[PDB]
Amino acid sequence: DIVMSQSPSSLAVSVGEKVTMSCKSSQSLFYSSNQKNYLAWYQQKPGQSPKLLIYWASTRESGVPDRFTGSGSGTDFTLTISSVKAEDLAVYYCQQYYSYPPTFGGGTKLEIKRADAAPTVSIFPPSSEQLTSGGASVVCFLNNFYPKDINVKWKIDGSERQNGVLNSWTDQDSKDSTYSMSSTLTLTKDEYERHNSYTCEATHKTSTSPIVKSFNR
Amino acid sequence: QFVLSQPNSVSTNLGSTVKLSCKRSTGNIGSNYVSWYQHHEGRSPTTMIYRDDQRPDGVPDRFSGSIDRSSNSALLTIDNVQTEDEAAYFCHSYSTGMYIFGGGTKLTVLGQPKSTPTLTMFPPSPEELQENKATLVCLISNFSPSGVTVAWKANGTPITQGVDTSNPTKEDNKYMASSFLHLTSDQWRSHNSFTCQVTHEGNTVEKTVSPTECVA
């Protein structure tokens, strides 16, 4: 076995800079005669399969951007992106193939610093065919904002409640480079047919007021 | 896997038509070649019939084969039985690495007339009685042919164990054979009836002895 200590686990950079992926192996990966290293870096795009970048810890694959110039020998190995782009915000993996078995790294997510943007909240009422089953759930669609740090509060007839609420956070986009989030106000049919005003408030850094969108039956 | 059932002994007169069977137990006999061989005593076995019915060059037409699907048995037919035909005959079927043989029917040529056996009995000697042992002797002589069967009996009950019987040998113009019966010292004088019956083609000739005998 080999342990592939790869740091940092999280990383946030800006557009158009250099960042140094770092990974260190437990044992050396340098043949004496071969004079090469047995390390491979892979790019696992979010919602996608991984793909190889550089083999032999230096030589790059065909179709790999020249900005990706890996480095290192023996134990420590470092990959570098000469000019970061908005298309390669992927978790980079550090894999060895020096001896059986081949183990991978922890991954280095490429979160990115983005120009601050506003969230586009949108509330949706439950469906009529949904009420027939016996349930009633309201969803407020927040999407395309920066940063990811946000909190959504659910108000029902003024008073707040925290009983059974879903929270889904997305990944950065390749064209707009933003985050998104949804939330579900799960409720029974008998409980839904008592109140008439349903509101969801989100707390984003752009505005000081809780960005609110509501509906009245 | 099957058994070739041949009878035990047959006797013929010069110039007869004799059929010799070879009954297969399981499986159709019409799928395994049977081969009839002639084994004469004091010689090596020869070959009379092969591939069911064809016979080798040097086998007279007297010898013939025959497969009967009804009785599931081959039949070696020997016409005009000659003097030298007194020998044992055998069948042999082969299949998938299994060479199965028959029983070996002993064909007898009767150049001599019918003859019943002359019996002779002998009780244990005094010196053997001293050693706490007894043995009876049955002398079967001048009988022909040799399709014989022995039976030692004690007080009517057929004694089974402690009996040895020699096959009919040639010493006279007709055959000769002998049989023995081991006993205990006290077990001989225990019963007062011993008999030796020989089944000679139906005739069960018999003789007897008794512990009350002439002494001194």
Added chain:
Amino acid sequence: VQLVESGGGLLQPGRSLKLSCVASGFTFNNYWMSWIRQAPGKGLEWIASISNIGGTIYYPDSVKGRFTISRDSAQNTLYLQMNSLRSEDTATYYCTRDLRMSDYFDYWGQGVMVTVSSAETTAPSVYPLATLGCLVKGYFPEPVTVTWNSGALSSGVHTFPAVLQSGLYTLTSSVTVPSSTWPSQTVTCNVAHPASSTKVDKKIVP
């Protein structure tokens, strides 16, 4: 065609013997070979079969491992290496040439005899019986001589065959004499075993 058989003799349990079978005339590597034996008073039994060169070899389960067939092309001979012999193997062994297409044996060999017994060569014990006959009980190996008055009684000499009771032979020899000759004259039974060099004389008196 000719099959020359060799070997054979007296052997005790566990011993091993190799029987040879020299071929003659035919093309040796073009005919299957086999070994067939017959025990005294029993039917023919197949023992081993070999192919033309040695691609296929069968044995019956009775001699599984105990026997080992062999054949040599250069010297045109057949072999049957038998181990751990038992009393059941007491038989005369024959080698045959077979046609695998006709499933039969065309030519056979002389057949050498094989004796498998744990018997030790010992002398007999005579017993007079009263026609008068002697009794030769428990003798080995075959044979034994029996005479009356050291060869003076010519007629009536009726010596019976031998039989294997419990590993040993046993026989009787009677002589029918006229009624007037006994118990008048002295009737002498001379018995000798030339194998063990003995000579016992027994008279007959009841």
Added chain:
Amino acid sequence: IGYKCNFSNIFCTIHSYFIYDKIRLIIILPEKCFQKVYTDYENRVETDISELGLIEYEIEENDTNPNYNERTITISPFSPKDIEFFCFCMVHVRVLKYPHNILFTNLTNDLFTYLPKTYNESNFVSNVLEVELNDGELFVLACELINKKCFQEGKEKALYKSNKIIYHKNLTIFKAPFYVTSKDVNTECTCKFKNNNYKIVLKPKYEKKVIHGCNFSSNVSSKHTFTDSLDISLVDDSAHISCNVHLSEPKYNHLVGLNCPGDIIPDCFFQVYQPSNIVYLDSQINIGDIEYYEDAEGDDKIKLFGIVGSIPKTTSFTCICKKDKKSAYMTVTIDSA
């Protein structure tokens, strides 16, 4: 041992793929043979052995014997062309090319630049090399063994066996058997070099079981796939059954055999009917290197051989499968073109 031709104690015809074999002659034109050669026989020319297509050769002249001045030559399997060199006194020799791939694992100091492609220690995986071999091939290596126990043993309790394990010079060579029966077979060669221990493990590829033959077996689950099948348990007792393979190609990489559930007559595939006409196969085909293999699926009987190369005469032979009174004929017809 090797080929030999004697002219002191007719035509000495020889042609084969020579795996470091020694051609023996006993005593001659043109000039001194094995360095002078009768290439163009009609123009009667004298081409030297240096200006020929063979990669590695070794020519030897022995006069030490007080009766003959013998001439010998060793031919490495490394030959990129089919070279034909003659020398009479008649002794014509055409060195054939080995049709199989060659895997050279050079683990020695000597820079072996004769063959470009080669394998060395970088291909090892923690001092382990797992080589796959096709139906028939040749694996070469150049190093020095520890206690010289190599390429014969096997640790899966199933020993990988070869047609020829040839040990000349400092080169261990393995000749792959054209058809090995077992599913798992292996061989270990523990060689040492540069104070490191290297283990070369060899195993066969998924053998294309395309036996140009006939399967009269009454079984479906067979480890061997014949190009022709049938059951023999059903025919008439007097129905002759004819399975007649015909092969007609320039080169041959074929496997020919049969799976007979009954007995096989004659002792195939060494002996065959021409068509009691029992002839020998190697002489009937007239090819030296013909491999023979046999197998037994329980009670089924498998007998086959492997022909590799050209063939001099249109040969036809016939083997027989006999189950009880039933019969099954098979006719192989190898054409020559």
Added chain:
Amino acid sequence: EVMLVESGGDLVKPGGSLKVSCAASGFTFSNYAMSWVRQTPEKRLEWVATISSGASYTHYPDSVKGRFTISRDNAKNTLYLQMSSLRSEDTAMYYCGRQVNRHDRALDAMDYWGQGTSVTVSPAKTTPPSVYPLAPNSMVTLGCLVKGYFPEPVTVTWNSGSLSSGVHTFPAVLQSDLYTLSSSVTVPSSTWPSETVTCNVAHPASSTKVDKKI
């Protein structure tokens, strides 16, 4: 183009067995050796197994030794993997990757990776989802809710894959032994309700396929 299309994703009770294929296309299959790797739900990669060029050699790690069985059919140019005595930890996304053979070595990097087919190990039998539309005047956002299903995953598209610009599909969350997710697509306000958008949901484990329009 190189194309490794995997197959064989479904739920198994702990102890069951499953075979996953990988139809390789567009290259000399017997020329290059193959391998499998799995990615846990935690996005952790593990090496599953690797097979030789002609299936003579195989390797497995100490974790799945004797439990999984890699195999390749170079006649049909497809790779396989037979998993047995499965545990809950065996739940991952199993990738079919082709090793590099430039330099002839048994252990190398994966030149090309496959789409990946995920498996799941749980005793809860597959329950089909309930598709509920979500309708709301500028740059109108459209929603589609998928509630109450098991197990992961579920494919969602809009207009059979015609709409992709500015479309978000929100991840699945675990609902007391069930799952639930939703999706949002943004369109120009003139295009709706004048033209029809249809949520295209698909659940592989239960062969479910719902096409509910907004």
